[PDB]
Design a protein around this ligand. Structure first.
Ligand SMILES: Nc1ncnc2c1ncn2[C@@H]1O[C@H](COP(=O)(O)OS(=O)(=O)O)[C@@H](OP(=O)(O)O)[C@H]1O
Ligand SMILES: Nc1ncnc2c1ncn2[C@@H]1O[C@H](COP(=O)(O)OS(=O)(=O)O)[C@@H](OP(=O)(O)O)[C@H]1O
Ligand SMILES: [K+]
Ligand SMILES: [K+]
Lengths: 274, 272
C-alpha cells in the first residue's frame, strides 16, 4: 500500500520518515548508558509519560514544559526530526520510540540505558488512534470505523500489529533496565506509579515536588498546555474503558476472541484490563 | 416537535389527522370477518401482509406484483386506509401500529382476528433508525446516539415499545389473537405459516407453500416495487443490532429492558 511508507513489513507515515534513517536507527544509532527511553505502541500514553519524566527532571516546576514543545523535550528517535536533534543532544537524553523490538537500535541491547515500556488495553488504543489519525495526511485514511477496526485487528496500521509489538517486547520485562508499566495502573494510581518510576530511575522526590508533578501531568492541566497537547486533539478524553462507547457488540465479540487467541502464550496477569 | 401528537403518541405530520385518529378509536366499525395485523412499527408488518396476501392467492404472485402492498393491507389509522377500508368488502385485511388505548373500541366486542407480530426491540430500533434517517414530515435525529435515546424514552412514532407490548399482551390468551415473533418467522418460516393457516382456518398444499416461501422471501420482496415503497426492505435478518449497539448501549438497554419487562414471563421473548 502506497499510502504508507513500508519498512521491513511495518507501516510508517509517508512524510517525516526516511527508510535510510530507519536502517541507521537499527544499525548505527548509538545508545548511551545514561539514556532514558519511553517505548510505546502508538496511542498508549507516550506523551503523558514524557510529561511526567520532564516534570521529574524539573522537580515539578512547569516553566520549561510550558515553553518548549513536548516533541523537542522528548524527541521521537526514528523520525527525521528526532533523529538529528538527538545526535546533538547532551546526556542525559530523554526520548521515545514506537519501534517494535526487531527495528530498535542494536546498540541498546548491550548498553545500560533504561527503558520504560508503557502498554495500554488495545481496545482503548484502537479508539484513540481512530480519532487522532482519521483526518490526517500521509497515512492511509479508513473509509469507516468498521474498516479501521479491521485494519487494526490485522495489524495493517502505523507500526504494525499491537499483538506483535507486545510479543516482541515482553521478553525484556525481567531485565534490570526495563520497566513494564500500563496506562491503566498509571490512570488509576498516578502517585504509586510515579513512585515505581522513581525507584527504577533511582530518583528521590520531595513531597512538594511530587504534588507538583502530579498536578501538572494530570489530564486537565496537560490539556491546557499547548506545548504538550498538539483539528483533533492529542488529549482527547484521557480515561480507561472508552472502547465501550465505540465498539459494537459484534466487534467486542470478535476482538475478545482474537485477543484470547493471540495472547494465549503470555501470562494473563500481564494485562490488567478485562 | 415535528410530529403530530395524539393522546401523548407521536404520528407523522403528513397523512394523518387528529380527527381521524379520534374516529378510528371511538367510531370505526370492526367486522367479525376482519383480519388485522398489529405491530409496533418495524417489526415485520409488510412481511406478514405479503404472506397473508399470498395465502389468499394460493401462492400466485400476480396480484401482489400489480397492486401496492399498502393498498392490499391498508394502515387503518392513516387518512387513506381509513377511507379505503370504509369502502372494502369483507373479508378485510389490514394493519395497525396503534397501541391498545388508541385501537378501535368496536374490536373488543367483535370476533375479528388479530395477529400481533413482535420483534426484538433492539432490531426494531436499528431498523427504524435507518428507515426514518432522512425523511421529512417527522422529526429527524441528529445522530445514532440521539435516536437511541429517543427510542429508549418512547419519544418516537407510536410511542414506547415497552408500553405497546404491555398494552396488547393481556389480549394474548383470547381465541381470536395470534402472537408471533419476527424471530420465529425468520428462523422457522414454514412452521410459522402453518400456524397462521391454523389460526385463520386455511389449509395449504406443498406447491402452494413453496410459492408462498419463494414469493415472500426478502430477496423476492426487495425486487418487487409494489412491496418496496431509504428502503423498506433493508437487510431482513435477526440480530443486526449487534452491528450497531455499542457495548455501553447494549448494557443500558439490557438494564432498561429487564426493568420494564419484569412483570411478564421471560418466555414471551425468544431472544437475549
Ligand atoms: N495526562 C494524561 N492523562 C491521561 N491520559 C492522557 C494524558 N495525556 C495523554 N493521554 C492520552 O494518551 C493518548 C495519546 O497517546 P500517545 O501520547 O501515546 O499518542 S502518540 O502515539 O504519542 O501520538 C490519548 O488517549 P485518548 O484520550 O484515549 O485518545 C490521550 O488523551
Ligand atoms: N420478506 C422479508 N424477510 C425478512 N425481513 C423482512 C421481509 N420483509 C420485510 N422485512 C423487514 O421488516 C422491517 C420492516 O418492518 P415493517 O414492515 O414492520 O415496517 S413498517 O413499520 O411497516 O413501515 C425491515 O427490517 P430491517 O431489514 O431489519 O430494517 C425489513 O427488511
Ligand atoms: K524489570
Ligand atoms: K391466543
Amino acid at each position: 500500500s502506497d499510502d504508507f511508507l513500508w519498512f521491513e513489513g511495518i507501516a510508517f507515515p509517508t512524510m517525516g520518515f526516511r527508510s535510510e534513517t530507519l536502517r541507521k536507527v537499527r544499525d548505527e544509532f548509538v545508545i548511551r548508558d545514561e539514556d532514558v527511553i519511553i517505548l510505546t505502541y502508538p496511542k498508549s500514553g507516550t506523551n503523558w509519560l514524557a510529561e511526567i519524566l520532564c516534570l521529574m527532571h524539573s522537580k515539578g516546576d512547569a516553566k520549561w514544559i510550558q515553553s518548549v514543545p513536548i516533541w523537542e523535550r522528548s524527541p521521537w528517535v526514528e523520525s527525521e526530526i528526532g533523529y538529528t536533534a538527538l545526535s546533538e543532544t547532551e546526556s542525559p537524553r530523554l526520548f521515545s520510540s514506537h519501534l517494535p523490538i526487531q527495528l530498535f537500535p542494536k546498540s541498546f541491547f548491550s548498553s545500560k540505558a533504561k527503558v520504560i515500556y508503557l502498554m495500554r488495553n488495545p481496545r482503548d488504543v484502537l479508539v484513540s488512534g481512530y480519532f487522532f489519525w482519521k483526518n490526517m495526511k500521509f497515512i492511509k485514511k479508513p473509509k469507516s470505523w468498521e474498516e479501521y477496526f479491521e485494519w487494526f485487528c490485522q495489524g495493517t496500521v502505523l507500526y504494525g500489529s499491537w499483538f506483535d509489538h507486545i510479543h516482541g517486547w515482553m521478553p525484556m520485562r525481567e531485565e534490570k533496565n526495563f520497566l513494564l508499566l500500563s496506562y491503566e495502573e498509571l490512570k488509576q494510581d498516578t502517585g504509586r506509579t510515579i513512585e515505581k518510576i522513581c525507584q527504577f530511575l533511582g530518583k528521590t522526590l520531595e513531597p512538594e515536588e511530587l504534588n507538583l508533578i502530579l498536578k501538572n501531568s494530570s489530564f486537565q492541566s496537560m490539556k491546557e498546555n499547548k506545548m504538550s497537547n498538539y483539528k483533533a486533539q492529542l488529549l482527547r478524553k484521557g480515561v480507561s474503558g472508552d472502547w465501550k462507547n465505540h465498539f459494537t457488540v459484534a466487534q467486542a465479540e470478535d476482538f475478545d476472541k482474537l485477543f484470547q487467541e493471540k495472547m494465549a502464550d503470555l501470562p494473563r496477569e500481564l494485562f490488567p484490563w478485562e
